[PDB]
Design a protein around this nucleic acid. Sequence first.
RNA 1: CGUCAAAGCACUUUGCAAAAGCUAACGUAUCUGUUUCUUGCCUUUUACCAGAAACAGCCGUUUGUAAGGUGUGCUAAUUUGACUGUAUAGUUUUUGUAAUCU
Length: 68
Amino acid sequence: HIATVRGLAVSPRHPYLFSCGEDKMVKCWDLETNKVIRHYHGHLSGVYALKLHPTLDVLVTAGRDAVA
RNA sequence: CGUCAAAGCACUUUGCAAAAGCUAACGUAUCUGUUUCUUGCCUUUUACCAGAAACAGCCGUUUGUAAGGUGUGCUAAUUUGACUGUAUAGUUUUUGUAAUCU
Ligand SMILES: [Mg+2]
């Protein structure tokens, strides 16, 4: 991460660990290899929260751009 | 080669689907890109250097199947599959040592 990390979430159905930070990018860490595999890009500013949907394969992030 | 069965057959165009299960060339051939690391050259970025891991793309290949095209046929041609496939009265089976009664 380039800047402060502001949100983590360990998926209970995948061996993943999603993280977000004030550096505007959301990362998907593969916990089987401890390496970043996915990048989620659209965010105009820092990201302050990260949550994972309990059932679907979808995640929600909300940040300073007044948009979730 | 033979008998039986069903399928028109040979070449070809396109669509659809699939392609390691028991460690192994779908391709005896061989490119590119992204991410995360470690490097090289480095004044800063692109373009770069060369090794790894995880992913993708492109050039191709094979098979199945569906609908067509061309040339020849259905007054036959070819293909695919299956088959416990052959003679023979002269001792080892199928051209009778049978009848007779008990
Ligand atoms: Mg500048």
